[PDB]
Design a protein around this ligand. Sequence first.
Ligand SMILES: NC(=O)C1=CN([C@@H]2O[C@H](COP(=O)(O)OP(=O)(O)OC[C@H]3O[C@@H](n4cnc5c(N)ncnc54)[C@H](OP(=O)(O)O)[C@@H]3O)[C@@H](O)[C@H]2O)C=CC1
Ligand SMILES: NC(=O)C1=CN([C@@H]2O[C@H](COP(=O)(O)OP(=O)(O)OC[C@H]3O[C@@H](n4cnc5c(N)ncnc54)[C@H](OP(=O)(O)O)[C@@H]3O)[C@@H](O)[C@H]2O)C=CC1
Ligand SMILES: CCc1nc(N)nc(N)c1Cc1cccc(-c2cccc(C(=O)O)c2)c1
Ligand SMILES: CCc1nc(N)nc(N)c1Cc1cccc(-c2cccc(C(=O)O)c2)c1
Ligand SMILES: O=c1ccn([C@H]2C[C@H](O)[C@@H](COP(=O)(O)O)O2)c(=O)[nH]1
Ligand SMILES: O=c1ccn([C@H]2C[C@H](O)[C@@H](COP(=O)(O)O)O2)c(=O)[nH]1
Lengths: 526, 528
Amino acid sequence: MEQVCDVFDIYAICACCKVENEVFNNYTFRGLGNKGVLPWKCISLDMKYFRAVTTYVNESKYEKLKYKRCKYLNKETKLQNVVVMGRTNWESIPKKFKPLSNRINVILSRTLKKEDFDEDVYIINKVEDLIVLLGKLNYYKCFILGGSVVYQEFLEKKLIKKIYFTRINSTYECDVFFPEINENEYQIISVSDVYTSNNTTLDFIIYKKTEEEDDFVYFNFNKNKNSIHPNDFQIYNSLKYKYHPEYQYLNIIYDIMMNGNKQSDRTGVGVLSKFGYIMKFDLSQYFPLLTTKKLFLRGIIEELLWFIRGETNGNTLLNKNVRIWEANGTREFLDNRKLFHREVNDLGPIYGFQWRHFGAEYTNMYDNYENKGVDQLKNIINLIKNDPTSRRILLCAWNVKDLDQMALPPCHILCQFYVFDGKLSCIMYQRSCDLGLGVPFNIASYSIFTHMIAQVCNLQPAQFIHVLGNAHVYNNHIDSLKIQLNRIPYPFPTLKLNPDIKNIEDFTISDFTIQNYVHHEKISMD
Amino acid sequence: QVCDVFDIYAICACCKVENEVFNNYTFRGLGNKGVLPWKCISLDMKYFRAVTTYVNESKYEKLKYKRCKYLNKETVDKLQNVVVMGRTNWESIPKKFKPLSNRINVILSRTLKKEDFDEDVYIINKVEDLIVLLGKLNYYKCFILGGSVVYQEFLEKKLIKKIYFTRINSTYECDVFFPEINENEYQIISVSDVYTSNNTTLDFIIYKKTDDEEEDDFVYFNFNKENKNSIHPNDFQIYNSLKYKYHPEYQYLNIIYDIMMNGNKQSDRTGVGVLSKFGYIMKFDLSQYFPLLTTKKLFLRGIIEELLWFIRGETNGNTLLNKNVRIWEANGTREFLDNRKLFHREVNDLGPIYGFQWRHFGAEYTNMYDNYENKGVDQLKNIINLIKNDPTSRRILLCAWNVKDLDQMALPPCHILCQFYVFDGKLSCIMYQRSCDLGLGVPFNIASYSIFTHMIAQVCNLQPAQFIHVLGNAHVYNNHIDSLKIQLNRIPYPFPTLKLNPDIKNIEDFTISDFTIQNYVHHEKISM
Ligand SMILES: NC(=O)C1=CN([C@@H]2O[C@H](COP(=O)(O)OP(=O)(O)OC[C@H]3O[C@@H](n4cnc5c(N)ncnc54)[C@H](OP(=O)(O)O)[C@@H]3O)[C@@H](O)[C@H]2O)C=CC1
Ligand SMILES: NC(=O)C1=CN([C@@H]2O[C@H](COP(=O)(O)OP(=O)(O)OC[C@H]3O[C@@H](n4cnc5c(N)ncnc54)[C@H](OP(=O)(O)O)[C@@H]3O)[C@@H](O)[C@H]2O)C=CC1
Ligand SMILES: CCc1nc(N)nc(N)c1Cc1cccc(-c2cccc(C(=O)O)c2)c1
Ligand SMILES: CCc1nc(N)nc(N)c1Cc1cccc(-c2cccc(C(=O)O)c2)c1
Ligand SMILES: O=c1ccn([C@H]2C[C@H](O)[C@@H](COP(=O)(O)O)O2)c(=O)[nH]1
Ligand SMILES: O=c1ccn([C@H]2C[C@H](O)[C@@H](COP(=O)(O)O)O2)c(=O)[nH]1
């Protein structure tokens, strides 16, 4: 008829870390505590979150809660929340925080009774006594704070209506663990933005138990296009709040699937296409390596270093077993570009040559172009250092003169940089965007490049901003992207650079570390 | 009050009538010679039927409750709306539409007999008889449909809760007019998107008499979202008093507001100081309007000449100056060039700027008088050919940022590139701007590249779709702040329209006389 946890609004809130090429799932985050305390030193942002949720009340909503609880109990006609702790949980809290401020404190125990406590707290020695207590109290909501024993038995008994679950994206030694959530009993309905706090990333997810209004209608008086189906996005559409920054990428895919224009293309596969998007990623808070599928970064980092050296020799990448440019360097591909006098894997005056030698005459991939052309990479590093408010800090790969000599014209047209308050942001304009295959890597590439330029200019990375021009999904990718859109992102990883690298030319592959990459399974887009 | 008890609204449509000053009264034409002043404008008709038939039955129980208590009753003893038409208005409606479908028809008439119409059609003979009739009916809301007499008397009797006012942005001969809405009595609260229907733009404004399981979760996710810039948002009383701000000019205005509220204080070369942010997109639908800002006056002749000068490939600033187009004057002075270290550059020789790069990218620049025929890459020709011959190309770009020539330019281009996109016979254009003077430069820039998109689309036999503006370093000069505060609190008018001479089929064949702005309605000019 009614559930106890719905009448009395019984929630659980917790924070779980990871515990010691692996496979990941929701149970990856399950570390609760260690040796009777928390596994980590204070993660302060989670404490602020935990305090806002457990202390927040809305007075205007109590009368309905009050009415509803009377009806269930068969009774007639400042506000605070109730919080429930195991006895072990209670003893691990620092004394200066007890009783938890502005909350009604309740402790479960058998070995201790109210005579053993100095504080303003309720003792109860069984779960049934909490329901009795709640029927007699005036309160807004009831939050179960753990520990592990308390969680397990409240989940066991179907007494939890929502789990407020912080995912701590780092590994610690643990000896107690959140119960394995039964995906048939609970589903994720919301996921927050990603944050960094105390040298770890984290997000907040929510499991749920499984007049001027008419003017709006008037103004919408004038509102199965692409053969895409509802049930094919059930998980994606069931989420209420989608604040994880990975949704900037997934929503654009959704948008192209549901509203894109059908078109042919140079390749003949055919695409759905739209025109003009912007994504923004906060590199101060996370490294935006996509988590709804597995991505590798060694190739794109070697590519970036190969760019910065000004190289155009495709053999250099192939010798590191990086095959990104291999198809663009074959005799057949070059011939079909009319590059009949071009040696195999000589890609012509592409990215690297334009960044270090714009306007120089290209000869072959072995020439020494020292002091030919405009070394715009050096120029923009100098403007950032010495003229940070300049609105001319731009790095351009679209050299109109050289386009036909390139193996193919650049997609990443330009980077513009912005400096404020000791922090560096970067816009990259992409003329053509393969959303299913290329954009994931391109986000990672320029995100890394922003870190490198910021460090050698002694700035901190801020936003990477990604403007998409012709944004398209290949029809060959649609079934894979349907799978991918129905996965829930994980908290992003972090990127660390060797801090002793002071000049842009001095990085090597080993100066980069990606830490705490948690990700869904690899996907063949075909 | 009566009109709040019984939910009495007015709904009307007004055209313009036969340096002009504009105001809300500019739109006041109701009828002419017993008919509507215009041929049918189908979009306003669709909105009309929608407003006057829409009913939310779940919301009626409280309206019935409210009306009964007002009348000291307990009962009123399918929910439709009520519609009130004057007799002139009622008789001039085509026969096959009367009685108005799914509406309770009510007619003010001192000469019509209750007999000649069915029992479902009501006939009153004074205004207070409607209040009596509303006391005895079940209805959602009561709409006053006109005509001029009915508007005037209902309005001077303070019997109107809101006005749903369609602004028809064209001119017609009229002999009856809406009453001048006293802005001390009513005020605009919501403004719609701009539209094109039957060869006129129009918009829709609203005048006003003067699971919470997921509500809490919203609060928690805001737990860290703890105004910073010495701006007092009470200076934007009108702006923040609006409820629905759907006019596409709000794309521009919302960005000024964002930079004021949240911009970063930075200095610049002139010491003036700016508020800046990084990264915006605006999109304007050229199929439905020409986005010439209306919250201040904008002139376009110089803007068009500069474009034509670009297309000719010119770099000689004297050409513009002899036409009194002075956009580039300050960049061509002896002093400005010397500061650029261009010691060997003639005054007003701007070097290899836009026009030279569009028609001659990669050519060696000598001076502004040289013959550059067939030197360098003719990008403009190239992209026009790609549009016509390979329209699904993702390489249709027009780039002015020639890294090799920047230092020889009087200054590097602010408009880095245009990219084009073709689908189903329609042309859209993205322009990326590295540096955006929101107060002065950006309004002109939206117009320049909106026009350019029309020109490219016509010489390619395409229709213009969107113009899409990407702002890089976006700034408000500190000395514009007072002027933009005034501008944020003006309500835009429906946009004008751009017409090109349809005979021009080559990008190089346009002349100044081939461009006409139609029905530009605007607020007064502002010195920034
Ligand atoms: N990261 C997080 O989100 C959280 C972490 N933690 C960590 O978890 C650990 C503590 O959790 P845990 O070790 O599982 O111990 P708990 O905090 O779960 O409390 C255990 C004790 O609570 C009492 N108790 C539990 N259920 C009942 C009941 N039905 N009736 C009566 N008394 C009851 C008993 O106390 P008695 O023995 O006196 O009967 C039991 O021994 C610590 O490491 C703590 O720091 C704690 C909370 C949340
Ligand atoms: N686009 C728009 O927004 C609208 C346009 N129109 C146009 O408006 C024009 C009509 O202007 P108008 O002539 O002012 O139309 P009206 O309907 O305002 O004519 C008023 C009539 O209503 C009756 N009436 C007025 N006041 C009273 C009263 N206090 N008590 C009783 N009966 C009353 C009289 O009928 P009697 O003669 O029997 O006394 C009078 O002739 C037409 O050209 C029509 O096309 C129509 C509706 C709205
Ligand atoms: C890691 C923390 C945490 N985060 C989240 N999201 N859920 C949790 N169940 C906990 C653990 C917890 C439980 C009970 C009280 C405290 C506590 C500590 C110190 C001070 C206070 C206070 O309220 O001042 C509370 C922590
Ligand atoms: C110019 C139109 C208009 N727009 C708006 N916004 N307000 C208006 N007062 C009118 C004029 C009007 C008034 C009464 C009935 C009709 C009518 C005509 C033909 C058919 C129907 C119908 O309902 O089928 C109604 C028009
Ligand atoms: O870094 C890259 C390089 C290529 N592409 C994709 C976009 C297009 O699908 C294709 C290039 O095609 P053109 O736009 O040049 O035709 O490769 C990317 O998304 N990112
Ligand atoms: O067409 C133009 C030309 C200039 N500006 C403004 C932007 C900057 O305020 C200034 C450009 O100077 P720098 O970005 O080079 O500093 O001119 C525009 O907004 N639009």
